[model samples]
Target: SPMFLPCVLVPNTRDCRPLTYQAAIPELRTPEELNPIIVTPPIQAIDDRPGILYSILVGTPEDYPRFFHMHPRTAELSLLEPVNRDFHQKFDLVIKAEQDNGHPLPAFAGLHIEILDENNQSPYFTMPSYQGYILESAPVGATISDSLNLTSPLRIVALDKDIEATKDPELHLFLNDYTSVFTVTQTGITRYLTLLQPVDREEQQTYTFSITAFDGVQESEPVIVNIQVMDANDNTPTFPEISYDVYVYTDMRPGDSVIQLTAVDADEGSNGEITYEILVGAQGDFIINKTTGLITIAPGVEMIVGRTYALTVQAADNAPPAERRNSICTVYIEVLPP
Candidate 1:
């Protein structure tokens, strides 16, 4: 028959165990122990008698325990690395034993080890990184998550290996180096991204930052948060000159440039771009470049005048019709006999 072994742990002297063949693995709760709770469970067999610690006989297990010790036939269970709760429940460790010296080591007892939960693992972002968008038009103090978008806003999710960490206030997260225009606040286990100040796309278009959790002692590995500011048609096209008077000879030949008109749009992208047109007065009498805003007489067009002809001109941006904006100005053209 095989030798019956004593338990790994004994009363009181948790640090010490006498005449034991199993390791003194202790199961300690939070603040007492962190994770990788190493505890050796007595071999519970179906048909066999109280089995003796024959030979722990293994170091690297076929499953469970990240590490093991043989001095005392022992193993540890860990809920770490990736503590995906629903992933797995049990595994196996090959331990050789016997009913009697005469009985061959019971077909190499494959000890199916049941792992226990350990909070040894740190928090990991549910995703590798996070990304979101906010329009520069968003108002000050707006919650990007609740206001700007309906899905996948400017916040992220990170789960703790220790279930207790769910309620532990120390496990909260914060933003780093991004408090200029934005701030991070937390409630429960969730972190929120808030606008500290209104954003102006003209000054800044995007904000890239990092998120990390803290336990009042340590910081989790950082995750990236990239937020893009969607542009809105905002500024109106501005004519540098409200009106201009130019001297031109009546003999001013067709295709002659009367003057170059210039306007500036302060908005960004297509909204900041300007296009020119002869709105009411100068149609057919003069031509203007749509993109350059330069004006001139149409080729083969007649111009026999000494009186000033008021040409109403407009410069506009490509914003959607509802938001489209334009500025108007006038050019007084006087044609004189050469």
Candidate 2:
């Protein structure tokens, strides 16, 4: 049989003894104090193989009550000390639970960056620097593109930092020192060209206009547009036959029409509408329809002797507010002795 030794069952029971006589058993009293008891396994030497160790320490000064203590009496203790440093010192060692591995650091939230280059060279005309030509006046609004002729119009483009090789500001176009010769407007990111004035090919048989394009920020190189204004049958009518001599009787009555000299104009429209007018020196005795070129005798006709009835007749156009051309025909009417 194994001998059983009773451990401290209570604080006061450590001194109390059990009774030998059954009648001498002492009466048990209520407990007044508490002392915690820790259970333990049999004591043995620490194992020499590699293992792990864990411990808790508490103290006041050099001498203080160690409330409880436990140790595995084995030699296989591998200590892993917890890092006890400030957050800034041990930040790298701290384990972060959440992280993003896909995106890189941003430069700006919603904007894009673009690098620009300098505009060192001036723009040159793809066509010619100088040219000449001839055109018909009727082709006033006609366009001259970059064709084979030396006098053809050139396409202009400006280059600058804001307007790069790929980006075109389509700046305004000018003729001879910024005189507005044409207009350029942006459609999408590119610019289109349009004419601003009419050019008469006939009146000016030749024209030399200097054109240039300018970015709002910088002016471009100049391009000369030398045009040879050509002449067409654009001239007004000229009389083929100069003078007309006619004999009229003094008996010519009022309201009677006279057949006058005819003149023609080679030009078209109002340029061709010819009218006849009796000059002031005449007897104040005639009236003419500008469009019909008809001369009629009025009631006040004075037939003076040898007063050589010298009459100046002129033909002009009844077109608009002014006359196109003044082509006059002088007719001498010899008043016969009636």
Candidate 3:
């Protein structure tokens, strides 16, 4: 119920000049359990024959709460109401003690009371959500700080609600999901969303997860983080067959479907789209569909019995020329007598 403020009194003499005082700023609890608490090590009085009277004076700037009291019998100060570090970080008060004996002037002293900090508030992120973009080809240690769409780069900042606790938000940033692929990097007051593993747009185009801020004492509301993984032409078109061989009949007619070959690419969007081409060996006897990868006999070509034709088929992706990828395969056809 009572907290102590160190008070000293100069000995002897009846005049205020004879009494000199030196005070150390005392401290008070943020939410003192007891409404009116007493602060002690009572002030010593020169003479108490007629009993000295104690009174408190508010220093310039009435901006502070006027809830301080001085005991008439004991020169101890009383806190009328609990102080809040968020509100009154420090209290400036003057204590005046007087005696009806001989000294008419009162002994004046200054008291600067500091309110101790208490973690009663939670930390919060500056934004409700952070949106960013990263290329699937980004390195494992790459950080995604650019905005997914327009405007400024993605920035993460967490703040403490308590004024004093703001010195060090003491916020611990963490991811709620995608921990293996994503991580948080903190420097001072800023945070970065970093990649812990390589990403593949083909597997997952976009990732949205929650990052929470913990203030040790309390946890703030989770902030949503949305990251879009951009596609990269990192994969090449591949054919299942090392080389294809087929038998054709001498009676086979023109424009007959020879064979349909498919190639696979593990990229995304245009990066994965495969286009077929006859790179070599067509020899005006066959044609391949650019989009379908289907090989067919030339419209007016004739097949000779016991003759073999070798065709080279190429499968390429639709990515930009610089990043485009392709694979080649050979197809052999033997014309047999029907």
Candidate 4:
């Protein structure tokens, strides 16, 4: 931190008595992982005259002209290699005697070299990218771990390689693109994605976003995260009306065809495929097509005269876990007198 001032020689000047001083100056500092570290001292203890040269007097002989180099006539020291200040806290660079008239000047001078640190390293993630899932019906505000609630979350972790470990916030995680869909939170589960809002698999089957890690110095390359939103049985099959009335003549024999009952589902895939069933009330009186959705009288099924029966016909979607979206409608069948 020392700066030398050249005096005009009131008593210190008016003439050359041959400059004599061991003082060196260059309050130097530079971070590690850098190149072309050059530092020239403000003093020239040797090599002050033509034909005079400077050499490393003390310190490691291997360091001479390698990490530290001094000009032959200028006596300027330049650092040539990378410097890690952590290990080599300071330098005792002693530039010494040079023989000009075949006489070596024993006087030596050097400066204490200090290396400063820098924000040179960027944060790195554990992985380059990741993939996960989210359910279409994922409850908003509730913590979602996986595509399924209360499941293991898609975890993301990033660490800063610059400094030593400590108990504090080392980095921050950011979600780009669709920020409203997800929010990164700490369960100390490292890092995770929680549904800040609901998502529809039908609307957006898959969502893509970017996750970046930053510490104060520099940000890391983005780690892409793709979420495959699973479909949920959020819809129920529906019919045009809540009930249907059909009159069948008693003369209509068994194995005879009758009116057709139909229903529709709005979902896609297996979640939309519907199955029809005459739930109990039909009592073997009617049969339904499994895939065709057709309805007909059962073969050898009995029907009495003047009998009126209420039937419960149900339509259900082919959903997972034996789960489903189902709706029921009443179908009235009157056995007419023939």
Against the true structure, whose TM-score is highest? 3
lDDT of each: 0.63, 0.42, 0.73, 0.66
Prediction 1 global C-alpha lDDT: 0.63
The reply for model 1, stretches above 4 Å from the true place, is 1-120, 145-152, 164-170
lDDT of 3 by residue, 174-249 (tens): 7889999888876457777778999888889999899888877788898998899888898999999879989899
Per-residue lDDT tens digits for candidate 1, residues 202-278, read 78887888888865555689988877777788888998778888778766777877788888887877888888988
Clashes of 1: 8
**Model 4 lDDT tens row, 233-319:** 787888889988889987787667676767777676889888887776767778777666667788887778877778787888999
Ranked candidates (TM-score, high to low): 3, 1, 4, 2
Clashing residue pairs in candidate 1 are: 1-100, 3-52, 4-52, 5-52, 22-72, 23-72, 35-120, 250-336
Would you estimate the TM-scores of all the predictions?
Answer: 0.61, 0.32, 0.71, 0.60
Best by lDDT: 3
Off by over 4 Å in 3: 1-80, 84-113, 116-121, 148-153, 161-170
The lDDT-based order of candidates, best leading, equals 3, 4, 1, 2
What TM-score quantifies how close candidate 3 is to the native fold?
A: 0.71
Count of backbone collisions within predicted model 2: 10
